[PDB]
Design an enzyme around this catalytic site. Structure first.
Site, PDB file in Angstrom:
ATOM      1  N   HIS B  41      18.804 -22.113   3.709  1.00 20.47           N
ATOM      2  CA  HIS B  41      17.754 -22.500   2.771  1.00 20.47           C
ATOM      3  C   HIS B  41      16.343 -22.157   3.273  1.00 20.47           C
ATOM      4  CE1 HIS B  41      18.084 -26.509   4.941  1.00 20.47           C
ATOM      5  NE2 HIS B  41      19.383 -26.307   4.732  1.00 20.47           N
ATOM      6  N   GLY B 143      10.408 -30.093   8.496  1.00 24.14           N
ATOM      7  CA  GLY B 143      10.313 -28.967   9.433  1.00 24.14           C
ATOM      8  C   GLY B 143      11.321 -29.021  10.590  1.00 24.14           C
ATOM      9  N   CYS B 145      14.531 -28.898  10.319  1.00 26.83           N
ATOM     10  CA  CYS B 145      15.753 -28.184   9.987  1.00 26.83           C
ATOM     11  C   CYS B 145      15.944 -26.973  10.905  1.00 26.83           C
ATOM     12  CB  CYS B 145      15.752 -27.682   8.546  1.00 26.83           C
ATOM     13  SG  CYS B 145      15.953 -29.005   7.325  1.00 26.83           S
TER      14      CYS B 145
END
Ligand SMILES: *[C@@](O)(c1nc2cc(I)ccc2s1)[C@@H](C[C@H]1CCNC1=O)NC(=O)[C@@H]1[C@@H]2[C@H](CN1C(=O)[C@@H](NC(=O)C(F)(F)F)C(C)(C)C)C2(C)C
Ligand SMILES: *[C@@](O)(c1nc2cc(I)ccc2s1)[C@@H](C[C@H]1CCNC1=O)NC(=O)[C@@H]1[C@@H]2[C@H](CN1C(=O)[C@@H](NC(=O)C(F)(F)F)C(C)(C)C)C2(C)C
Lengths: 306, 306
Positions: B41, B143, B145
């Site tokens: 993503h 942030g 991820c």
């Protein structure tokens, strides 16, 4: 988002850990540039530790008596001196992995990460507070001595602790990196105990703010209080006095959550007087005091390289 | 000696963290050899995340669309593919700091260290368990991820987690490094919740052994019990069934302390039925279930480079 006992990433310090052997005694040392810092009692056998004369043991040593190993590279020692309870070993190679660094002496109430090491090799990392009684609640076995504690701020490692010894109730004592003990402890195997500990009030308040931030707000009451009135209460439950300096340091959290410091003080006063009634705050059943205001902001604002 | 939630030293993994940017979306990636692994993503804007078609978004990208930064060095991307919910970016430079490593899929109940990262830069490290409901109780902001979880065994890093998302009650979900979610979760911003969690029985027993080892023994009773009888009780309090495999894995601790597993089971049965009566075990007011038998031995036996 969640809240955990977070340790500083340990890579910068892992690159500095070495093993120091003198005779049959081995422990950890910290290699910064062309110096290795280790506890002075590397020069002691079993016998020596009841009552060591360190100046005497040391004068009988020479440079070549210290075996310094970085991994399976040996470092050649070319000088040595004792500064307080720490030995400095000048080696002929600068550690290329030395980070930007400072030696600092932290205050009681400040937190730091410990890199627990055996044989110059890293076992784990965890976060600790310097307790008001100058101990730390560590996790340390035989051979952990010379393990270090530190803070990171961007690129800079502030080393504040070197591990030396374990005190009667399973807690720990050590020095700054200039070899000065925190607390009234000495590096000998003689009977010593920590004074009575106390709870770090400002840290408890910071953790409460972290809980508000995480949406755990049940414990907030409708009241305020004065600093004086709060502190009379805190005293009963063996909490540190909260000072104006502590109030000021809680200013960021206060302003972010919109809860005045003395309003959070009122909520804590209630918790001390009523207990938690089988409820938890951030998953925890006791009030936690090993997070500073800075630790809460860092974790809650996402501050990196540190 | 003390007992703490110890994280694996993070240096080996810090050397692999990078920032991946596609359009205006940025998150963390893991650079091993000449590949960068990140959540797929990264290819999504805000709009896309309600209901993304990832195969569709991706076909519209090309290699040069991915900005990979290792510190302030940019890495040139020369290939890309999607494997489940993970994107693999082939770069033209091998990471010289790649450690020996394996990708593993851990089981519910196993613990690992998370290196929480923002902007490809390390914020902190902490220990977590994969919960029976396939969430982790993390601490993660916007942030984070692409942050990874891992075990170390001597020189070898087993990566078992990559962070993707936060579920309704402030807990966390993600994938193995082949991009397969733990649990029934998907990478879209749609309503999802964890099933009911359960306590990791074997871990609680391990922690109890750690307490005996640390000299905290008040909770030991004079009784034994059968596995069956223990498990009927555990069931009521929402504990995992204890299996023969779990009994076997507790064998080292059992043998070190001289306490049979089913004798420790009898002591736990009592704690579940009577509560702790305002006493703590290892400083803690609740029974802790995020230490495995291996974690207890490691910490209590001093196992290094890991
Ligand atoms: C450490 O790793 C060191 N080990 C040795 C061994 C030799 I031979 C020489 C020098 C050193 S430093 C560290 C050990 C572990 C022990 C268990 N937990 C720890 O933190 N340090 C010590 O063993 C120090 C060391 C001796 C005695 N000592 C102690 O920690 C002892 N404590 C005390 O006597 C008391 F003051 F109460 F704290 C004891 C081993 C826990 C009984 C020095 C010089 C103080
Ligand atoms: C993460 O860091 C990512 N951020 C972005 C931003 C963009 I624009 C694109 C892709 C990603 S990945 C991480 C964020 C943090 C957010 C707070 N705590 C975290 O762990 N991931 C997400 O924001 C993922 C991502 C979207 C939505 N999402 C969520 O975590 C959301 N959860 C859910 O919708 C639910 F299913 F319930 F879990 C939400 C942001 C917490 C509401 C993906 C693809 C799932």
């Amino acid at each position: 988002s969640g809240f955990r006992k977070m340790a500083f990433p340990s890579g910068k310090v892992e690159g500095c850990m070495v093993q120091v052997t003198c005779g049959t005694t081995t422990l950890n040392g910290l290699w910064l540039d062309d110096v290795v810092y280790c506890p002075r009692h590397v020069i002691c056998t079993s016998e020596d530790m009841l009552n060591p004369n360190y100046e005497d043991l040391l004068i009988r040593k020479s440079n070549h008596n210290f075996l310094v190993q970085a991994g399976n590279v040996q470092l050649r020692v070319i000088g040595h001196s004792m500064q307080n309870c720490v030995l400095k070993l000048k080696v002929d190679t600068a550690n290329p992995k030395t980070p930007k660094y400072k030696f600092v002496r932290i205050q009681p109430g400040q937190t730091f990460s410990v890199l627990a090491c055996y044989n110059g090799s890293p076992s784990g990392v965890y976060q600790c507070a310097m307790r008001p009684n100058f101990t730390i609640k560590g996790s340390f076995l035989n051979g952990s001595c010379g393990s270090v504690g530190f803070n990171i701020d961007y690129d800079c490692v502030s080393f504040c602790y070197m591990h030396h010894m374990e005190l009667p109730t399973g807690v720990h004592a050590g020095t700054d990196l200039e070899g000065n003990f925190y607390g009234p402890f000495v590096d000998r195997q003689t009977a010593q105990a920590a004074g009575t500990d106390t709870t770090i009030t400002v840290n408890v308040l910071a953790w409460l703010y972290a809980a508000v931030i995480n949406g755990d707000r049940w414990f907030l009451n409708r009241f305020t209080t004065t600093l004086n009135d709060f502190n009379l209460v805190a005293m009963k439950y063996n909490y540190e006095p909260l000072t104006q300096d502590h109030v000021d340091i809680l200013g960021p959290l206060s302003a972010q959550t919109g809860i005045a410091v003395l309003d959070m003080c009122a909520s804590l006063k209630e918790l001390l007087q009523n207990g938690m009634n089988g409820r938890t705050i951030l998953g925890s059943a006791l009030l936690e005091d090993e997070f500073t205001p800075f630790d809460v902001v860092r974790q809650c604002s996402g501050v990196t390289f540190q």
